[PDB]
Structure formats: structure tokens, C-alpha cells
Amino acid sequence: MGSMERASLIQKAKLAEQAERYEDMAAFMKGAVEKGEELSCEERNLLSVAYKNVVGGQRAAWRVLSSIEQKSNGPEVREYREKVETELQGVCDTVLGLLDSHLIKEAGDAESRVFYLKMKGDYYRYLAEVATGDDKKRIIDSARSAYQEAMDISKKEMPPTNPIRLGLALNFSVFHYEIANSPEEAISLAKTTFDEAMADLHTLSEDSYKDSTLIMQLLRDNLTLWT
Amino acid sequence: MGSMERASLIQKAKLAEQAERYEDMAAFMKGAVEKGEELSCEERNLLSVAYKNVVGGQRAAWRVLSSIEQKSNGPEVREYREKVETELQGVCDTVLGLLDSHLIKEAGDAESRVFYLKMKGDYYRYLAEVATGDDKKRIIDSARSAYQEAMDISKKEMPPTNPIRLGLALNFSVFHYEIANSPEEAISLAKTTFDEAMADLHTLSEDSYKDSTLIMQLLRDNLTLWT
Amino acid sequence: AGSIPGRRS
């Protein structure tokens, strides 16, 4: 999107979100990132929403096809699952490439650096969901490493109710439960995250309280399912 | 999709429908059509479902963007509406090309010929929804002509409860109301269609009765909105 | 005003 203005790319990403055109949204925000400037808080959210929707559709389709394939065990179901899988891996690789060139290395503030590292953990986690070969373990460790670095920064630099800190802990707990086969670590992280947020709620305004309690409910929903 | 077997294309179109991957579905069924054989009843439905979903997403997005554009009256909203509009027109042109090369000319039975001509009316109607220039009237007449030929055949060759005959009349009535500025023609067609179907229901099995009464309800829903 | 949904089957 090299011939489009950065501001036009951002404005069109917002329009694509309104039209529920998430592939367009992602391409516009990919173009905005490749302009080389850092992203604002709002712009980071647009980037994240766009690719979460795109990969979310791919993951949902992959699970449908993987389920059909497992029940069947001609080549068509496997071939088509492989096609969707390859397209999903390409989207994850694209996002990871944006983070590596050069969003993360230019992110100096806690809010931006933790946001991008959480992203990095998430997209390695999506790669891990479909991984089966020689690199499943290496992909899992890449996800863990990104989440862990984000955790370390957020615990040092953000309050326990910060929505990015809470969403990071939520997703890392899902990583532990669903990917790393560590349900006790998942439950422990979710419980400690919830309890430390609850004790900090008194410091918040009405609007910040709503933002934080929304994500604490997601932690509670998982604990209810896991225990 | 020239190197894939016809049967594999059909099987993968069914898988894509299950995965809600309608762009893939449409491409698979485009490949199946271009094999050059006629389509069975089931295969025609797959072709229709695939492209209805694809163009349905494009139409929904175009309406969102057109609404934003009308409220605003920089170039970004118009530019992005034009992009979506061009992509929608390309999908309609693709479907119309499949009908013209060579689905319609090889369709000799009433069920297949009326099905394809209804399709032809529908995709010209979608072109008419976004048309504004020198060819709006010609596109509208192309839609009308296709629907009319389909109507003439269906009245001669199908019973009044036939679901294709009913869906054709439903969509032609929407054409009259929404495109041709003929609400009285729309209401008259929907009423006569409903009444003649109701009088033929006694001839049907339990399953055929369910198929027909489902579409008669849609006719009634429109009449309720129009009167 | 609704045309036939036609998006499932």
C-alpha cells in the first residue's frame, strides 16, 4: 500500500472495521505499519483487531476441517485442511514479521512493548495450535518466551488492573492450559491475576473499573470451566 | 482449478460450506462449472449458495460505506466504497459469465433453466443496486428480462408450490419493489403467488409441504411490510 | 423487504 498516505490507511482501516471487511482492515493496517512510524494506542488496537478477526476465521475453519479429517480416520479433506492451515500460517508469519520488523524493537514504553509482546505470544500460540512436526516444541517455547517477557515488564511497569496486563495474563493462562499441558499453572495464574486486580479496583474511576472488571470476568469464566 | 478433478471440486465445495469459507466454496464451484458438464440439482444449489454468501457480504459492506458516504455529503470514504463496489461488480460479472458460458444454453429441463435464469435476474439486480450511470436502465431491463423469461417457463412447466417457482416470484417481487419502483406490481405478484400456492398445498407430501410453506411465509412477510 | 436468503445448503 506504498502509494497511500499513512492517515488514509488508518481512516480506511476504521471504515473496513465498520463494514466488517477484516481482510481489508488487516491489509490497510499492514500498510500503515510498513510506513515505519510507531503506532499510537488506538492504531495498535486497530492492527490487533484486524488480524484477530482474520486469523479467527481461519482457526474456526481449520477446527471444522480437522474434526472432519479425524472422523474420516480420498485425499480431499486432508488437502483442504492443509490449504487452510497454510493460509493461517502465512497470516501468523505476516504478523510476526511486522512485530519483528520493526514494531517491537522501537517500542520503548511499557504499554506498547507489552502490547506487541503479547501479540507475539498470541500468534506463536496460533502456530502451535496447528503444529505437529519437528518444530512444535520450538514454536511453543517461542510463544512462552514472548508471553514471559511481556509478563515480566507488565508486573514491573503496570498496575494489576491494567487491561493490557489482564488480557496478557488471561491469554498466557490459556496458553498454559491449552498448549503447554500445564493446567495447574493456568489456574494459578488466572487466580492470582484475578485476586490482585480485585484488590486494586478501589483506585479506579467508574470507566476504568468497567474496563478492568470486564476482563476479570473472563478470568473467572475460565476458572469456572477449569475447576 | 483446471488440474483438480470435478468430483474433488464438488467435495471441497461442500467442505468449504461446512467451514463457512464461502470465497473458497465459490472458487471450487466456479472450477466445477468450467469443467463443462451440466450441473445436478444439488450442484446448482452449491453454486448458488456459494456466490450468494460472497456477494451478500459485499452488498452488506457496500451499504455500510454508502451510508457513511451520504452522511459525509477527504476522498477516502468514496475511494473505499468504490473499491468494494468494483469487487462486487466483478463477482456479479463472474457469475453472469458462468451463466452465459455455458450454463443457460445447455439447460433444457425446466428446473435447471428456471434456476439459472433466476440467478441471472438476481445478479443483474445486484448490479442495479449499485448502478448510477448511463447503464442503470439497461441493467434493470436485463434483470427484468431474465426474471420474466424464468416466470414464463415456471408458469408453464412447474406447479404453483414448486420452491424454485416460489423463490423466483419472491425475488422478482423484490425486484419490482426495490429496483423498478413498482410497489403495486410487487404486491400483486406476491399476493397471487401466495394464493395460488396455498390452493395447491393439498397435493403435497409432509416434506414438500414444509419446503413450500417456508417460502410462502417469506412472501407473507414482505406483504406485511409493504401493506 | 427480503429476497430468499439462499445462503445455506
Add this chain to the structure above:
Amino acid sequence: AGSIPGRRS
């Protein structure tokens, strides 16, 4: 088990 939906805003 739910991650953050993250698909709106």
C-alpha cells in the same frame, strides 16, 4: 477456555 475476544474496536 476463552482467550480475550479482541475482535471489536
